[PDB]
Amino acid sequence: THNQWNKPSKPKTNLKHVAGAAAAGAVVGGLGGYMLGSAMSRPMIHFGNDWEDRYYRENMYRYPNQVYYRPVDQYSNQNNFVHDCVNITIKQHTVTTTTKGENFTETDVKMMERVVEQMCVTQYQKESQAYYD
Amino acid sequence: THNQWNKPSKPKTNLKHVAGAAAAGAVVGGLGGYMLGSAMSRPMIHFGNDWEDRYYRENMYRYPNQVYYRPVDQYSNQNNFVHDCVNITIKQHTVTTTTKGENFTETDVKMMERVVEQMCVTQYQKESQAYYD
Amino acid sequence: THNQWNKPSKPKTNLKHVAGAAAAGAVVGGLGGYMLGSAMSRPMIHFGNDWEDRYYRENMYRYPNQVYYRPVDQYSNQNNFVHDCVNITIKQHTVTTTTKGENFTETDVKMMERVVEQMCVTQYQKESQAYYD
Amino acid sequence: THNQWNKPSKPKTNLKHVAGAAAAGAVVGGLGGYMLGSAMSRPMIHFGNDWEDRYYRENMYRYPNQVYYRPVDQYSNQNNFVHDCVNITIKQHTVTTTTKGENFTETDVKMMERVVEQMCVTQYQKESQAYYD
Amino acid sequence: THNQWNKPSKPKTNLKHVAGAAAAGAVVGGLGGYMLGSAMSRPMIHFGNDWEDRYYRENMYRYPNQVYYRPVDQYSNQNNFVHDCVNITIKQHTVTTTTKGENFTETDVKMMERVVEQMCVTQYQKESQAYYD
Known part of the structure; x- marks a missing residue:
């Protein structure tokens, strides 16, 4: 027997710049590698019920x-x-x-x-x- | 026996720039690699009920x-x-x-x-x- | 026996720039690789009921x-x-x-x-x- | 026995720029690769009931x-x-x-x-x- | 025995630029590859009931x-x-x-x-x- 109750009330989630590798800058000179990196993050957010068993996630x-x-x-x-x-x-x-x-x-x-x-x-x-x- | 109840109330989710590798900049010079990186993130958001068993996710x-x-x-x-x-x-x-x-x-x-x-x-x-x- | 109840109320989801590799910039100079990267993210959002078993996801x-x-x-x-x-x-x-x-x-x-x-x-x-x- | 109930109420989903690799910029100079990347994201959004078993997804x-x-x-x-x-x-x-x-x-x-x-x-x-x- | 109930109420879905690789920019100069990338995303949205078993998706x-x-x-x-x-x-x-x-x-x-x-x-x-x- 498994019961899962989920009744959120007014969940206001705001996300402006989460994991965006954004290069927003003025390059007047040159010969320079600008924003050579990437974005490989996992901004995990959990709010509901969870139930797992006998698994292999990562x-x-x-x-x-x-x-x-x-x-x-x-x-x-x-x-x-x-x-x-x-x-x-x-x-x-x-x-x-x-x-x-x-x-x-x-x-x-x-x-x-x-x-x-x-x-x-x-x-x-x-x-x-x-x-x- | 499995029961899953899901009654969200007014879920307001706002997402402006989540994982967008956006290059928004003025390059007056040159000879420079601008925004060579990418975006490979997983901004996971969970709010509902979950139930899993005996799996192989990643x-x-x-x-x-x-x-x-x-x-x-x-x-x-x-x-x-x-x-x-x-x-x-x-x-x-x-x-x-x-x-x-x-x-x-x-x-x-x-x-x-x-x-x-x-x-x-x-x-x-x-x-x-x-x-x- | 499996029961799944889903009654969301006014789900307002706004997504402006999620995973768009958009190059919006002025390049007055030159000889520079502009926005060489891509967008390969997984902005997963879950709000409903889930139920899985004995699988091989990724x-x-x-x-x-x-x-x-x-x-x-x-x-x-x-x-x-x-x-x-x-x-x-x-x-x-x-x-x-x-x-x-x-x-x-x-x-x-x-x-x-x-x-x-x-x-x-x-x-x-x-x-x-x-x-x- | 499987029961699935789905009664969303006013689901307002807005999506302006989700995964569009759009190059919107002025290139007054030249000799520069503009927006060489692509868009290969999976902005997954789930709100309804799900039920799966004994599968091979990806x-x-x-x-x-x-x-x-x-x-x-x-x-x-x-x-x-x-x-x-x-x-x-x-x-x-x-x-x-x-x-x-x-x-x-x-x-x-x-x-x-x-x-x-x-x-x-x-x-x-x-x-x-x-x-x- | 399988029962599937689907009663959405006023689902308003708006999609302006989802996965369109659109090049909308002025190129006054030249000799530059403009918008060489493509769009190969999967902006999946699910809102109804699902039920699957013993399959091979991708x-x-x-x-x-x-x-x-x-x-x-x-x-x-x-x-x-x-x-x-x-x-x-x-x-x-x-x-x-x-x-x-x-x-x-x-x-x-x-x-x-x-x-x-x-x-x-x-x-x-x-x-x-x-x-x-």
Whole structure:
């Protein structure tokens, strides 16, 4: 005689990133093995009734994380790498100028004058030489 | 005699990224193995009644993550890489200018003058030489 | 005698990205293996009654993630890569200018003057030489 | 004697991306293996009654993710890559100018003057040389 | 004696992208294997009663994801690639100009003057040379 009663009430299970081998990153450079590994986990969750007898569940399991990293020649030369710019502003708030007078002679008013040339990146590669064999 | 009763009430199961080997990233450079791994997990979830006997579930499992990384020649030369620009603004809020007078002589008013030349990227590659064999 | 009762109530199962090997990324560069892996997972979910006997479920499973990365020659030279621009604005809000007078002589008013030349990308490739064998 | 009762109530199952090997990404560069993997998962979901006996379900399964990456020669030279532009605006809101007077002589008013030359991309490839064998 | 009762109530099953190997992406460059993998999954869903005995379901399954990537020669030279433009506007809202007077002499009013030359793409390929063997 075997009786199994299962009455869960509002089982709320949330799983965002369980065993996902996800590579979410910016690679601006290079010559690099990114996320060479895998995901071989067993996030077991048990909540109900169980009953087992005279069995053979698992045996001779083999999960070797064998990584062979043998880069022979790798060259990264004369490189200019820039990743991010964030919130680069130039503000002139409430710029008030009053030039009053009588029988005067205004000559030159330049409220701005070449205030900025470059803001984020001015990457230059001038007369750069590289030799190999 | 075997009896199995199963009465779940509102089982809310949410699964966003369980075992998805997802490569979601920007690769501005190169010569790099991106997301070479896989996903071989077993996110087991059990909530109901179970009953087993005299069985042979699993055996001789083999999950070796064997990665062979052998890049022979890799060259990244004379490179200018830029990834992101975010919120690059130049603001002139409430610019008030009053030029009053009587029998005067205004000559030159330049409220702006070549304020910016470049903002994000001015990538130049001038007279760059590379030699190989 | 075997009895199995199954009365689930409002089973809400949501699955967005379970085991999908999805490559969702921007590759502006190159010469890189993107998302070389696969998805071989078993996200098992059990909620009902189970009953098994004298069986042979799985055996001799082989899931080796064997990745062979052997790039012989890879060249990335004289490259100018730019990925993103976001919200690049130049604003002139509430620009008020009053030029009053009597028997005066206005000569030159230039409220703008070549304020910007380039904004996002000015990628130049001038007199760049590359030699190979 | 075997009895199986199955009375689910409002089973709402939602599945957006289960095991779809979907490559959804922009490849502006090149010479790169994009989404070389597959999808061979078993997202098993069980909710009803089960009853099995004296069977042979699975055996001798072989799911090796064997990827052979052997690019011999790959060249990416003298390249100018740009991906995205977003919300590039130049605004002049509420530009009010009053030029009053009596017996005056206005000469030149230029409220705009070549404010921008290029906005997103000015990709130039001038006198670029490449030699191979 | 075998009895099977099946009375589901409002089974709402939604499946958007289950196991579809769909390649939905823009390839502006080239020389790249896009979505070389397949979809060989088994998203099994069970909700009804089951009863089996003395069977042989599956055996000797072989699902190797064997990908052979052997590009011999690949050249991408002197390329200018641009992907997207989004919301590139130039606005002049509420531009009010009052030029009043008595016995005056207006000479030149140019409310606009060659404000923009190019907006999105000015891809130039001038005097670019390439040699091969």
